[PDB]
C-alpha cells in the first residue's frame, strides 16, 4: 500500500484532489477512452469534491470525458430527498462540473426489482470498461461502502442491512433519529472494489484511528473490510494525522519518510490549459 | 457471510435441514441436470440428516437426481468399521433414501495410492459439474473437513494427519483411546470447499464456540480453516445459541437482526407433491 | 504448508539443498525443458549454496539445464561492488558451477527506468514458463525478498524503500553505517513470489523466531508478508530448532511427528551418475 | 465484579440511583457518621442525579449527612464558568437537595499550588473517614477520573495532562472548539479511588463499549485505568445494552443471570418516611 | 513461578505428592505446629491423593499434625451427598490416612447463613495461622476454586454462582444434565488463596492447555482467575506434556531446562521412619 | 508513568545523567541522610556512567554520600573476571568517583550460601533506610534485572536461571560464545526494585522496541517484568527514538508533548559550586 499523511482534513482532501487531477488529466480521457471514476459521498470526500471543484472553474480540470459510480444508495428513501446520495453527489458535485448527467450512475434504492438494480450496476460497470480509479472512505467498523461487518470479502454489489454503527454515525442527517435512518442500502461490493485498477480510501479524523489499524495493521478479516485491499494490487490511503493515532510509531516514520517519493504524484501539478 | 441463530440443537439442525430441501426442489434436479451436494459427518449433522429423511418419507423431498460427495474418511480404518465415514453415511442416511448409489462418492481411505484416489476425486467432483452446495461443520481446531491447523488455504484434495484436538475429540469414537483412532485421512481441501457455489457450515454447542470466534471474528488464517470462506461469495453459517458463546455481543444482535429476512430460506417450506387444486384468485 | 524443522543451521541448509537436489533430478531438465529456480542471497542461503556446490563437484547434480531468478537487488549500487547480489551469487554459486551465464538472471539495479527493468524482469520469468521451485528467506520483519511491512500481497516485480529494520540489518556490509545501505531495492512482488509452483522458505536463528510466529501463527497480514504463503497450495518450510521458538508447543510437535514422512523427501538423495 | 445490564439509558440511570439511594438510607448517616460519596460529572451521570433529586423532592431520600468529594476538575478554569465542574455540580446536584455547602468537595483548579491543593484533598478524604462509595464513570480512552493512559495504578490525586480522547470527547462542552478545552486537571488516583470501600462506575452508549471491553475483558493495563478495579474487592459496573456491544455473549449472558440476584440491591427500594 | 513439566498424568501427580510429602516432613508439624494444607477436588488430584495414601501406609508420612482446609463445596447439596465436595474428600482421602477429623475443614454449603459460614471459614484459616501451602487446580475458563470469570482478584471466601463452563464441566457428575448441577456454591477467594505461603497449582491434560496459556502466558486478567499468582511469591505450576500444548516453545524449553534443579525438591524423597 | 523521548542514544544517556545529578544536588545527602542508589549494568547505562563521571570531574557532582545497590551479579564467576558486574561497575563507573567504597554494594555470586547472600543484600537496604532511585534497563525479553519471563511479580533478592534471550544478548562480551555466559545470577526482585521511592529505566535502540511495547502498552504480566511499574507510583521510562517503534503514535505524541514540562526535571540543571 501507499499511506499518505498530511497534516489536517484540508491538507488531505487537497492531496487527494490533487491526485485525481492528475490521474485525469495524465490519463487524457476523450470519446473513445473514458476515464471511469468510483466515488462516495458524506462529510469525509466533501473537502476533496470542493478543490475539485475548483480546478474545475479555474479550468484546470475536465470532467467532459470521466464516468461516475458512487458505491451505494439508500433503499426505501425517495430520490429527491435531500438526504438522498443522488441528492448529495448532484448538490455537492456534479451539478458544478462539466460532466455529462448521463454519464454519471448512482444506484436506484426505489427499483422495483432491487437485485435486478444491482445486478444492472455491475453490468454498466463492465460495459464502461472497468473502473479506472475508486475512491472511498472507511467507517467506524472499517467497512468500504455499506459491506458491513461480516460481509464477503469478494461479494458484488447487492442489498445491505445497516449495521449499528452506521446507522449511529447517520443518525444526525435524519432528525438524529435512530429509526429514521434507512434500514437498508444497495452496495456495490468489496469485490467489486477490488475489480478496480487502483483504489484510494480517504481517512480523516480520530473517530477513525481504530478502524485504521484494522483495515492496514491487522490481517484480512471480514470484521474490517478495508482490511481486504491487502490483497489489492494498487491502493493508496490518504489520511490526515489524527487518522493515524493507532497506527504503530514505525510504520508512521516508514511512510512519512515515502512522503518525498509520493508527493511527486501531486507534484508537479498538471493542467489541461495552454 | 450470514449467519443464522437459532436457541437449541434441534432448531438448527431443522434449519439447516430446511434449507437444503428447499434449495433442491427449487433447484429441480432431474437427469440431465443433477443437484450436487458436498456432505459433512458426525454428531452435528445428525440431526440435519433425520430431518431430511423425515422429509423424503413424507414424500416431500426426493434425492432420485442427487449426487453426494463427502468431505473426507479416514485412512487404513475398514471399510465395514462402524466408525468409517462410510458406514456413518451408509446407516445414517443413504440407506433411509431414494438416492442412486453410484451418485454417491466417498473417498477410499484404503486405496493403495491414496494421492491417486485424491485426484480421482476431484475429477469425479469435475465431471458431476462443481459442488452446488457444501455442507460442512467446524472442529475445536477450526478445521473444516481434515484440513487441519497449517494447511494451505488453496488445497486440494489430498492425505491429512489428524492433530491433536481432532485426535483427542474423535477419541470416544475409537474406545475412547486415542492410538486407536487413525492417524491419517483422505479429505478435500479448503480449495475443494471454496469452489462451492454455496457452502453451509452447521456449527452446535458451546465446545465449538471459541473455534466459530475464531473463524469469522478473527480473520483469514490457515491455523484455523474455516476462516477461509470470508472469501466465498455465499457461505451461510447455522448454528445455535450455545456456539455464539465466544462471539461480540454485537455481532449476534446484527445478525438476530436478520433472522425475519433469512427465514424467508425455510419458510415458505417447499415440496415436491402436487400443488392444492383449491387455491383461488 | 510442510514445517521441517531441523536441529542447527548446518542440517537446516542440507535438507533445502537435498531438497533442490532431489526437485531438479527428478524434475529431469533438459533443453526444451528447463528447471526455473527463484533465488534468494544472505547469510541464510549461504549453507544451501556450499552444499549444492558440493554435490556440483562430487558430479550428483547439474545446473546445465537450469535457470534462474534472483529475488531482489539494490538500487544504485555498481553490478561488481562486492555488496551487491549480483555479485553474491557470482561469488558464492555460479562461479562454482555448471550452469550458463545466460541463464541466471539478476535485476538491474542500475537500470535508469527501474520499474521498465522490473516488468522485463516479469516477462523474462513468462517466456521461461513461471517458475518450478523459488526458494526465499524472511526478514526479522516477516518480509518476502523486499516486500517490507506493508506491501500489497498480490504485489508484482518494483520498486521498494527499505525498511529501518532492513537497513540495519544490513548495515554490517556497509562498514556498519546504516547511512551507507543503499535506500531502495528492486524485488519481485509477493505475487510473483506466490505464482512459483512450489515456495521453499528457509529459515533460521532465534532473530527470526517472531517473525515466522507471525508468518504461520497469525493470519493472511501484509505487514509480515510471508504469512502471504498461508494461500499458496505448496509451501515449504524449512528452520532449526533456535527459529520455532515463539511456536506453540502443538504447533512443532504435530509437524516434528511428521519429519518421518517429510525426510522421504530427501531420502532417498537421486544422484545424476545414474 | 458485579455487572448489571439495563435496556436503556433511562434504566441503568434509575438503578445507579435506586442503589445509592438504598445504600444511604440503610447506612443511615447522622450528624456524627456522614456517608462520604464520591461523585463523577459528565453527561453520563446526568441521569443519575435527576433521580436522586427526584427521590429528594418526594421526601424520600435526604443527603443531609452526606459529604461528597468530587474525582476532578479542569485547571484554569474560572470556579464560577459555566464549564467548571464547580460549576455542573452546584447547578445539576447541589442547589436541588439538601447537602450541605461545606460538606462538598471539589479539588479547586485554580490554586496556585496544584500539588499542595492535591495533598490537601487526600487529607480532607481521610479526616472524612475514607470513602464509603465512589461513583465514577469510564472515559471512551478506558480513564478513570483523569487518569489518562498511561497514568501509574497507584496513582495518588494530582495533577494530569488531558490526552487526546478527552479534549475531543469534551469539546462539545466548549462550543466545540478543541483547542478551548483545558489542556490539564486536577484528579484523585487510580489508587485514590481503589481506596473507596465501594465503586460503581456507570458507562451508558455504544462509544463507551470498547473501552468497557477493554476494562473488564482485557486484563490489568494502566492503558485502561478502570481495568485496575479487578484488583477491587467491591466494585459494581452499571451500564445500558449498547455499553456491552464489545463484550463476549458469555459474558454478558452469566451476569444476565445475575440480574435477579442483582435486583435485590434495589429492589425493596427503602424511603425516609417513617 | 516454577512450571514443572512431567511426560504423563501420573508422573505429574507423583512429582505433586512426593513434593507434598517432603514438605510436610521438612517442615516436622507437631501439636503446637501444625502444617495447613490447602486443597482441591476433581479428577486431576485424584492421582496426587492415591500417591499420598501410598506414601502413608507404607509408613512414611504422616497427617496427624496436618489441617486441612478445602477450596470450595456445593450450596444446597446433602453434605453426604455422593457428589458433595464433603464426600470427595472423605472418600478418596481423609478415612484413607491418620489426620483427625477435627482438623479437616470444608465449607458447609447447608448453613442457615451461607455468608457467615464464608465468614467462619476465613477466621478458621486465621486461627490456623494461615496456609502453609495451598494446592488447587484450573478451570477450563482458568478459574482457581469457583472464582469464576469476571471475580475480584482480592476477593475472599463467599457465595459463587457458577458459570457456563464449570457447569458444563460438571454436568457428568450429575447424571450429565446440565440443570442439575448445584447453581452455587461457597469458595475460598482469589485473595485467600494467594495469602497462602505457597501455592501449587496441578494441571493436566490438553483440555487444560488453553487455560494454562491464558494464565502463564497472557497477563494478570480477572477473566482468568489463575493469573493472579503472576503476583504471589511462591508458586509452583505442576502440569503434564499435554497441558503445555498452548504454551511458546521459549517457556517450555526455559522450564524443562530447570527440571534437574527443581528434581531436588522431591529427590531426595524423606520419611518419617528412623 | 512518565515517558521521556529523546533523539538519539547520546541525548538519552545525558537526559539521565542529568536527572540523577538533579536528584542528588536536590536531595542534599549527608553524614546522617546518604542518597541510595540502585544501580545498573550492560551498555545501555554506559553513556550515563560517561556523563555521571564528566560531572564530577568537573566539580558540579559529588558522591560522597551516595550508596549504591547494583541489581544483579553473575553466580560462578570470578570477581575479578573483566566482565563480572563488580568489575564493570568499578573500571567503568566508581573508581572515576569520589563514592566511599565501602558505600557501594554488590551481590556475591561466589557466596558459599547464595540465598544467604541474597536475604543479606535486602537487609542492607533495609539498614540503608531504602532506594530512593533505583536505575535500571530492559532486557530484549521485557526483563527488570535478571527476573527472567516467568519471574514472580512481587518477587525479593534471589538466584536466577537467565533464559535464552539473556544469553543470547550477553554472549557478546565473552567472545560470542553463548555457552560462556554464566548460567545464574543473583538478582534483585520485582518486588525489590518495587519498593524504591522511584525507579527510572533507560531504554535505548530498535532492538529494545518491542520489549518496551510489551512492558508499556500491553498489561500487567511476569512474562515482560517491566509491566511490573504500572503499579508503580512513580515510574519514569527514558528512551532515544528507537525505542519508541513499537508503540502507538497516540501514545508517543501524548509524551512528546509533555517533554517541555518534563524537561524541567532537568532543566535548570544544578551544581554543587557555591
Ligand atoms: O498517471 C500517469 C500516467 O498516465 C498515462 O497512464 C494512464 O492513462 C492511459 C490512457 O491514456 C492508460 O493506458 C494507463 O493505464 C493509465 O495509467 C500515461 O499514458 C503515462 O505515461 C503516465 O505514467
Ligand atoms: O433457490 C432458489 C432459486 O432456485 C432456482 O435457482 C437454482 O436452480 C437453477 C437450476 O434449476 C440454477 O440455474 C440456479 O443457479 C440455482 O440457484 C430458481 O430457478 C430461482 O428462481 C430461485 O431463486
Ligand atoms: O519431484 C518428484 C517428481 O518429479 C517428476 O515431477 C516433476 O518434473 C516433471 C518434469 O519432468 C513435471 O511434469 C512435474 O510437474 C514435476 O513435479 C516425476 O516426473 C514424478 O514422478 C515425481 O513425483
Ligand atoms: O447496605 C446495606 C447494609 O447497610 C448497613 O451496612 C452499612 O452501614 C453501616 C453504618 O451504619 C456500616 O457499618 C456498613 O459497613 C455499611 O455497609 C446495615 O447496617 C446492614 O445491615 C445492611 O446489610
Ligand atoms: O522445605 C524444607 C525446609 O523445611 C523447614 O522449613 C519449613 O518448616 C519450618 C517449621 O518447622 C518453618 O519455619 C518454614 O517456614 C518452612 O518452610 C526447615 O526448617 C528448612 O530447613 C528446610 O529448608
Ligand atoms: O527533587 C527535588 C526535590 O528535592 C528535595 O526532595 C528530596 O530530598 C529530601 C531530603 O533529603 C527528601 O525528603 C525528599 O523525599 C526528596 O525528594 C527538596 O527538598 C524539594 O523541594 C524538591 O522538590
Ligand atoms: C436484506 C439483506 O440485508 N440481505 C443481505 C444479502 O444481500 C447478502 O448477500 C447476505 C450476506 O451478506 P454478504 O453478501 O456480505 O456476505 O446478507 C443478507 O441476507
Ligand atoms: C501424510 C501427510 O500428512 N501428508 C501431507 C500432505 O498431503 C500435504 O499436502 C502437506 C501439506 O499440508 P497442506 O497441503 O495442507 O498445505 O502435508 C503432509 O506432508
Ligand atoms: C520508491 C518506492 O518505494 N516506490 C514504491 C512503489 O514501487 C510501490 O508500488 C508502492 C506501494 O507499495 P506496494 O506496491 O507494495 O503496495 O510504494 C512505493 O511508492
Ligand atoms: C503537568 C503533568 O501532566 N504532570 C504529570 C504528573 O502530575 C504525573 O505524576 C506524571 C506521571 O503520570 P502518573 O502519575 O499517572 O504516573 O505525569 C506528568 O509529568
Ligand atoms: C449469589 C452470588 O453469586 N453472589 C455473588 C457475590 O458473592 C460476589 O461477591 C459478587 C461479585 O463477584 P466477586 O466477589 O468475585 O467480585 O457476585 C455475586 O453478586
Ligand atoms: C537456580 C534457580 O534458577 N532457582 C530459581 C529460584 O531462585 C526462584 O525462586 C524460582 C522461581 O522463580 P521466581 O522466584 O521468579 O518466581 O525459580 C528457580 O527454581
Ligand atoms: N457508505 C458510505 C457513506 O455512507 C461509507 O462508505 C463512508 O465512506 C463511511 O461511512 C464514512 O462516512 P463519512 O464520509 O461520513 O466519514
Ligand atoms: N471432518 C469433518 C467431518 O465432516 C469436520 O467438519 C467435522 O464436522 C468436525 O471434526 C466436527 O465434528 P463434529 O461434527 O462431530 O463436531
Ligand atoms: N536482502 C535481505 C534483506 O536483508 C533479504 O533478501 C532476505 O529475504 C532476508 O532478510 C534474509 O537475510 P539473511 O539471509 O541475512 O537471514
Ligand atoms: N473525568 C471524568 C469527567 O470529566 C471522566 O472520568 C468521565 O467519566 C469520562 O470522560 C466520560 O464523560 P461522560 O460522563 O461525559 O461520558
Ligand atoms: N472447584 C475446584 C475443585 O474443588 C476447581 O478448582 C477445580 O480445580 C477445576 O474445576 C478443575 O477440575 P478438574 O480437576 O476436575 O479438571
Ligand atoms: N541485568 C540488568 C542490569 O544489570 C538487566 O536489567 C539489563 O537492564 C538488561 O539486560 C539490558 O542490558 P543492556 O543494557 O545491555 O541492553
Given at each position: 500500500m501507499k499511506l499518505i499523511i498530511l497534516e489536517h482534513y484540508s491538507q488531505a482532501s487537497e492531496w487527494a484532489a490533487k491526485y485525481i487531477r492528475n490521474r485525469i488529466i495524465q490519463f487524457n480521457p476523450g470519446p473513445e477512452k473514458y476515464f471511469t471514476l468510483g466515488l462516495p459521498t458524506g462529510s469525509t470526500p466533501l473537502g476533496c469534491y470542493k478543490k475539485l471543484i475548483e480546478y474545475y472553474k479555474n479550468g484546470d480540470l475536465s470532467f467532459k470525458y470521466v464516468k461516475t459510480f458512487n458505491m451505494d444508495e439508500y433503499v426505501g428513501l425517495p430520490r429527491d430527498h435531500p438526504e438522498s446520495y443522488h441528492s448529495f453527489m448532484w448538490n455537492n458535485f456534479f451539478k458544478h462540473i462539466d460532466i455529462h448527467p448521463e454519464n454519471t450512475h448512482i444506484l436506484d434504492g426505489n427499483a422495483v426489482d432491487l437485485q435486478?438494480?444491482?445486478?444492472?450496476?455491475?453490468?454498466?460497470?463492465?460495459?464502461?470498461?472497468?473502473?479506472?480509479?475508486?475512491?472511498?472512505?472507511?467507517?467506524?467498523?472499517?467497512?468500504?461502502?455499506?459491506?458491513?461487518?461480516?460481509?464477503?470479502?469478494?461479494?458484488?454489489?447487492?442489498?445491505?442491512?445497516?449495521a449499528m454503527d452506521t446507522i449511529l454515525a447517520n443518525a444526525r442527517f435524519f432528525d438524529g433519529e435512530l429509526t429514521k435512518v434507512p434500514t437498508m442500502a444497495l452496495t456495490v461490493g468489496v469485490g467489486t472494489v477490488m475489480d478496480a485498477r487502483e483504489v484510494m480510501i480517504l481517512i480523516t479524523g480520530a473517530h477513525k484511528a481504530f478502524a485504521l489499524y484494522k483495515a492496514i495493521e491487522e490481517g484480512v478479516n471480514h470484521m474490517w473490510t478495508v482490511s481486504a485491499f491487502q490483497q489489492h494490487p494498487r491502493t493508496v490511503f490518504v489520511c490526515d494525522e489524527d487518522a493515524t493515532l493507532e497506527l504503530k510509531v514505525k510504520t508512521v516514520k516508514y511512510f512519512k519518510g515515502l512522503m518525498l517519493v509520493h508527493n511527486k504524484l501531486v507534484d508537479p501539478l498538471y493542467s489541461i490549459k495552454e
Open positions: 435486478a438494480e444491482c445486478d444492472a450496476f455491475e453490468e454498466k460497470i463492465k460495459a464502461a470498461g472497468g473502473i479506472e480509479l475508486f475512491v472511498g472512505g472507511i467507517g467506524p467498523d472499517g467497512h468500504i461502502a455499506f459491506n458491513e461487518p461480516g460481509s464477503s470479502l469478494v461479494s458484488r454489489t447487492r442489498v445491505k442491512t445497516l
